[PDB]
Design a protein around this nucleic acid. Structure first.
Lengths: 75, 68, 104, 136, 212
RNA sequence: GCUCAGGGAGGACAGAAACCUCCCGUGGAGCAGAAGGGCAAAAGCUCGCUUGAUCUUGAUUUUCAGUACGAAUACAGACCGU
RNA sequence: UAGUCUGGCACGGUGAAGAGACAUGAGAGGUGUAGAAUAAGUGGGAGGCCCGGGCCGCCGGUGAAAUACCACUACUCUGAUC
RNA sequence: CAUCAUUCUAUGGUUACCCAUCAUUAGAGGAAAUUUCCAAUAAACUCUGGUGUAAGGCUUAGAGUGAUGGUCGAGGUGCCCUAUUUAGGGUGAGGAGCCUCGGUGGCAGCCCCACCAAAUCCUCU
């Protein structure tokens, strides 16, 4: 009936959204980034290894089942 | 199509002086509507009034039929 | 049968063929002051009972359907009757019969 | 629904003739007299199936619909005359009796005097059913 | 229907007592109507002609470029040409003043179609109808609507209001605003049976008077 | 402008019977209905446009008394269709 | 068609009470938006008012259309009768 | 390429009067539950004309330009049953008539997600 068709590679607007609006959150999980920005769960994990080495996220917990990131600290 | 209770006059029921508590209650009657009169279909109503409601502080197992 | 509601036929007053407007003829209401109906009531009234025949032996089941032709051109607007043969069913421009069409 | 009644504390009475038979319950408010009536809704008026015309719930719905109709006219308190099928038939009031009385004790009506008017025969006509009774 | 009074038609010089005002006054008249239908084609419309110069005071515009230019130059008319009528009738929606401004217009003969465009019959379907005729008469044709007949229409109140007389003219042409009005609106009769109950005769303004 | 009933010979599915061609085809079909007559570049079949199934005098035929009616046939005067 | 049933008219009158009508003389009485303003409705009209002097106006604005001062009829309840 | 909104014109337009709507008169028509089909069946309401009643562009043809080479967004919209009744439980088909980019909340306004209504109702089930 209802078929969610997410993006395997980023639309120009969606990477402009992902490289702007994602660190403005309080959580960065590769299942919320996938659900919200209409992108893929595997792709949302691949996005956050690159943004790890930019220094714009915060690696709090990493497990195979579940990796969690958050916004960069206030100070 | 219309309310019958719109046209009900509200009348007081008086007990005779041999009783203590005077006012018995209130009796709605349709107003005089041409032929049939308010007082006409009102002058034979029974009131099954208990003694305790009628005399001040006495037995409440005695009743009194009083007619208008 | 079936007759169309339009008919390019002769108009007596105009003296030419002009397009007419076809409609089925009906009777008018019997005038109560027609000489025959006046004569009837004078005769019928009083004692004597029914004075003239009451036709009962009704034989035929259909009428000669008559068309009331009406000239369309608005100076003339003259009319005449156009009697057609007897028919049971009758309609004015119902549904033109077609060919090569499936009877389903 | 406009009387010259004093409005604060002094109560305006009617009498509700609660007739609870075993197959229907009648909550029926009248005046002090009984000659002029005010509201009457039954069990069967509310719930639309014949077996639960006499349910204590159907009688509750009635006495709620009675009481809120009775407050529009401003009859504050109710005298009560409870009634069973009576005559030669059953003298024990129906299942809907108590729930209907409780329903206008919960609604906002003051309760005057409660009595039985179950038409008790001194000595009766013959009762419906056989010599051998109602078999089942 | 027939009023039939013509008996001793004086005592309308009793004007100094009925009036104690100062200004431009119009001796008006209203007629008693009974058993009339508002919605259907019960028709009470047209014009009833007066011969005796009533003199209605209203804002008059006459459209043309003829002898009626220099003929109405002796009237002190604002005579206007066609190339000022567009800005008069363009703004009919947004600009919040009454755009037409003047309470009479005109369609001519020789200019028979004065304007039948979208800027023309936009004016003849909001009120103040360009009605008065100016064929080829060419002797007045402007002041002859301010000097001619008084008008009447039908509407859905069963009543009528009309201006018959005035202060300014003497009280001999104001009985010719009765004589040449009531002689007609009796003979003006369809099967609206005996419509004339009585005639509520007035000054402009004052105490009740009766003729019939 | 076409040729029909029916037959023969072929052709994926397809058979006794769908559709497609070629051939034979004097009417063996069809023409609303009873039967008879008539009919093949038609009177049938399919299309195109139409309202002559209109208006109007007479004459004539059929039944016949050589009367009506119905039905019909040849004209004539109009107005029209093709 | 006798008779019968039924309605009307006449013989056929008095008096009250109620109701539905109707003429006479009255008060209350209308609210699309919006204009500051319950816009019945038309002929008004830049014009009035009172003890020398002030107010309602006009515009601004809602709409097809805005009062002061002259009258009438549409139409909703009450309410009196030669 | 399609449709609407705009003005500019055009030998053009009936003004006691034109048009969109409100209404009645004049004709044509179905999916589905119900199966195993057949041919039916039988509404709801749309399409075109007259006539008539408020405002005010018509409907014709050409050009410039509002919003799209592709559009509206694209989502709320019913009935049925129940003493979970500001809630719960059903799952059929096919017909026209309406708010506007809502307010609030949760990682706030975007992306998402939640939650409270505007006018919906008729018929063969």
């Amino acid at each position: 009936r209802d078929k969610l068709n997410n993006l395997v590679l980023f639309d120009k607007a969606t990477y402009d959204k992902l490289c702007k609006e994602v660190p403005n959150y309080k959580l960065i999980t590769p299942a919320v980034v996938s659900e919200r920005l209409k992108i893929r769960g595997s792709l949302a994990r691949a996005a956050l290894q690159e943004l790890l080495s930019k220094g714009l996220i915060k690696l709090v917990s990493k497990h195979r089942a579940q990796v969690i990131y958050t916004r960069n600290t206030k100070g | 199509v219309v309310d019958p209770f719109s046209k009900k006059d509200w009348y007081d029921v008086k007990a005779p002086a041999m009783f203590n508590i005077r006012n018995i209650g209130k009796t709605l009657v349709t107003r005089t509507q041409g032929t049939k009169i308010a007082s006409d279909g009102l002058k034979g109503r029974v009131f099954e009034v208990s003694l305790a409601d009628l005399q001040n502080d006495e037995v409440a197992f005695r009743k009194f039929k009083l007619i208008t | 049968v079936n007759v169309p509601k339009t008919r390019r036929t002769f108009c007596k007053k105009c003296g030419k063929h002009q397009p007419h407007k076809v409609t089925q003829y009906k009777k008018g209401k019997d005038s109560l002051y027609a000489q025959g109906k006046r004569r009837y009531d004078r005769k019928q009234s009083g004692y004597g009972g029914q004075t003239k025949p009451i036709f009962r032996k009704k034989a035929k089941t259909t009428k000669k359907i008559v068309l009331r032709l009406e000239c369309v051109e608005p100076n003339c607007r003259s009319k005449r009757m156009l009697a057609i043969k007897r028919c049971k069913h009758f309609e004015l421009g119902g549904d033109k019969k077609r060919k090569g069409q499936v009877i389903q | 629904s406009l009387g010259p009644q004093v409005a604060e504390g002094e109560n305006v009475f009617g009498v509700c003739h609660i007739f609870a038979s075993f197959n229907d319950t009648f909550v029926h408010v009248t005046d002090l007299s009984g000659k002029e009536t005010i509201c009457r809704v039954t069990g069967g008026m509310k719930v639309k199936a014949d077996r639960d015309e006499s349910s204590p719930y159907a009688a509750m719905l009635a006495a709620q619909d009675v009481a809120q109709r009775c407050k529009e006219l401003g009859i504050t308190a109710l005298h009560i005359k409870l009634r069973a099928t009576g005559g030669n038939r059953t003298k024990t009031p129906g299942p809907g009796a108590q729930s209907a009385l409780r329903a206008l004790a919960r609604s906002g009506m003051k309760i005057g005097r409660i009595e039985d008017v179950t038409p008790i025969p001194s000595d009766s006509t013959r009762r419906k059913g056989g010599r051998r009774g109602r078999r089942l | 229907s027939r009023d039939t009074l013509y008996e001793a038609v004086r005592e309308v010089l009793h004007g100094n007592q009925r009036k104690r005002r100062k200004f431009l006054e119009t001796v008006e008249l209203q007629i008693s109507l009974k058993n009339y239908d508002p919605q259907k084609d019960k028709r009470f419309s047209g014009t009833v002609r007066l011969k005796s110069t009533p003199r209605p005071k209203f804002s008059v515009c006459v459209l043309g470029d003829q002898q009626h230019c220099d003929e109405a130059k002796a009237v002190d008319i604002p005579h206007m040409d066609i190339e000022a009528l567009k800005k008069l009738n363009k703004n009919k929606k947004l600009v919040k003043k009454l755009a037409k401004k003047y309470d009479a217009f005109l369609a001519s003969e020789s200019l028979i179609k004065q304007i039948p465009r979208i800027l023309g019959p936009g004016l003849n379907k909001a009120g103040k109808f360009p009605s008065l005729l100016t064929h080829n008469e060419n002797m007045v044709a402007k002041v002859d609507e301010v000097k001619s007949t008084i008008k009447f229409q039908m509407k859905k109140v069963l009543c009528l209001a009309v201006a018959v007389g005035h202060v300014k003219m003497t009280d001999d042409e104001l009985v010719y605003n009765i004589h040449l009005a009531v002689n007609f609106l009796v003979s003006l009769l369809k099967k609206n049976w005996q419509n004339v109950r009585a005639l509520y005769i007035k000054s402009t303004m004052g105490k009740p008077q009766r003729l019939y």
